[PDB]
Amino acid sequence: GVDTHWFHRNPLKATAPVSFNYYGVVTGPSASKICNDLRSSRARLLELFTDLSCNPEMMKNAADSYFSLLQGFINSLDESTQESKLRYIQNFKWTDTLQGQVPSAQQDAVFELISMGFNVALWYTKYASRLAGKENITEDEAKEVHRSLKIAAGIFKHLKESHLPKLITPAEKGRDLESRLIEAYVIQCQAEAQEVTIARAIELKHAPGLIAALAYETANFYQKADHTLSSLEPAYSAKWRKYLHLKMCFYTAYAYCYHGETLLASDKCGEAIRSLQEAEKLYAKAEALCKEYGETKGPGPTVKPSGHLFFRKLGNLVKNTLEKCQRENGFIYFQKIPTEAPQLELKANYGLVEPIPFEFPPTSVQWTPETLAAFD
Template identity: 40%
Template sequence: MVLTLFGIYGGLRTSKMTDWFHRNHLKATAKYTFDVGAVAKDLSCKTLCSDAAKRRVELLKLISDPSVPCEAVITSLNRYLQLLMGFVVATDNKTPFSKLRGLVCVKWCDSIKPKGEPIVSEDEAKDVHLSLKTAAGLFNLLRTKYMHEFTEFVPNSDMDPNILDAYINQSLAEAQEITVARAIELKHKPYLIAGLANETAKLYEKCGLALTQCNPKIVGKWKKYSEFKQFCYESYAYVYYGEDLLEKGKAGQAVAILKEASAPYEKAIRAAREYTKVEGVSLSTKPPDHCFFRRLPGLIERTHNKCERENGLIYHQKVPSVAPFLEIKAEYGIAAPKEPELNFELDPRWKDAYVGFDTSKVVENILSNSKNSKDHKHSGTKDEPVEPVREMPIFSTDKDPKNDSGCVIS
């Protein structure tokens, strides 16, 4: 259950963004009351169970609202973990796991009205950037440290290693998009912008490759989004690399590079069209309508004309028939996963309350719940479905931003 919560948090906090970013549905979970029946003998035990249920409800409510600060979610998460861990680890450290571990069995599904502002606030950009790196950190923590504890592997689920790899790479790529936009706004050197755009394209390529291993009926839309972003940033990388070559007096090579910039742009257009038609369970977004992408063809044409003009008037260099290979790497601004400070220390009340649980009845309780579940199925009655998360709506602005990058934060 703790691991599932990591996945929930990591995915949800990336929802504070515009239609430019793709995401899956919020991971929903059924209501859980922590009612352990006769296992909880003492009042202190029942109080702990009741508090755990309340904190779970509070946490899930915060997660569904993109306007809630990340710090508030982390605080609520840590308060819940302190109670939840009593059902996971032993309080006396004599055994690796709590004897109450099998009692907690929750049900969830796979994932698979703040108004957008036309002006990007630096604080908002930093918040989104941190949220995305934190999301990547949580997915990476789950992927590298906790995957081996799972007793069952379900392909195409949130816990599928390929899905987790896709989440990690997409979160980092979207974090780097913030860096690219900032570099454009601050008019950094073209070589730096080209390197960042190229690294971002590579991350989206890795995301798409991970999704290739999954069922296209589930991740098809997600994969096309990754392809769209990959080609979009490849095109930006070509444009700014051409600018860099021109600054270095290599006008002929710059012209050749700019001729190549249109190819990935056309691929991005095709991927965007396929995105609207392909199957997938994720939420639809509108990346080709975003100002950042709509400005790209004009940027390609202007930069190409500039390189042609400068070469014709000043440099008179031969244009290579084959463009230089895009061997550029960003020296600064590369996003890395950031693990949040999670508190796995037990709530102090567990030390005294643990002895109040009748561990001899744990197996009986589990078997009873299992029997009730089977009887429920044999009766022909369907299990109560997991209710989808009621998300707070995110409205995007209909105004183009008056900045160089064309990016907005909602």
């Protein structure tokens, strides 16, 4: 009843386990305790990423618990112009979504806050894609897919705007913390969330003009994400870019389809037919890209999306809508079919997805000047 969606996913990030043991540096019960609490809250959060029973409430509770403690290594307790003396005490090491098994490390607690935050965002995108793929998916689950993607978008955007600029040592090219990847993730999250919007708008029976505009803006996001990545080495970006390009073509086909409905409703049947013919072309291009995606090596599972329900449903809509327009033209309108496809310049008046703003929790109250003093 509610439609499924297929979202390509790169792998979650992995990290070296961290004991938070500073040996002689740390003295006394409270600093020792806070180190134990850092160790166990980090471990609990990491375990959740692969725990199939995890839901957003659990994730948010675990994330808040760890991030509030970790921030004692970052934030000053008494001045927004100052920083924790502990920022550089611990080396943290992480793999990256496109880099396979080759990790990278920094001795900077901000690098950890951002890397782990990035994995929390990825978790929300994977919870969304897992729900979106269920043949039995419900209305509440669709709402959760949409919300989770917007939450992820807001986390990635917050990291990019407010935390990445703090790193005195930048991430190397191709890594999640460089300029290009994180921006592509923000955009992709918006585009994916907007697919769900389009399905809901259709279900809620909105005008085809709104549907077409949302489809067009969705295609535009996917195109923009694709371009954002296009300067990366093809070896590790090609598969992801095939997905983005495939979705761009797909939603452009959607746009031409609903734009055809709008034209037909305006009694321009000839133009509607030409719009649907362009939808056929874009749809065929998307099918070709799906085959290429299925043949392209890179991060994530081998997949063949042209066989998926989402894909085949659009194919049927295009075919049926085109046939409808042809019948209208033959019985009712008798209009010439223009030679050139319409130039789409559609702007959605409603429904455009924006990230849900994210902020980290405040520094844990476990951090006190006495506790801080016990690190020497």
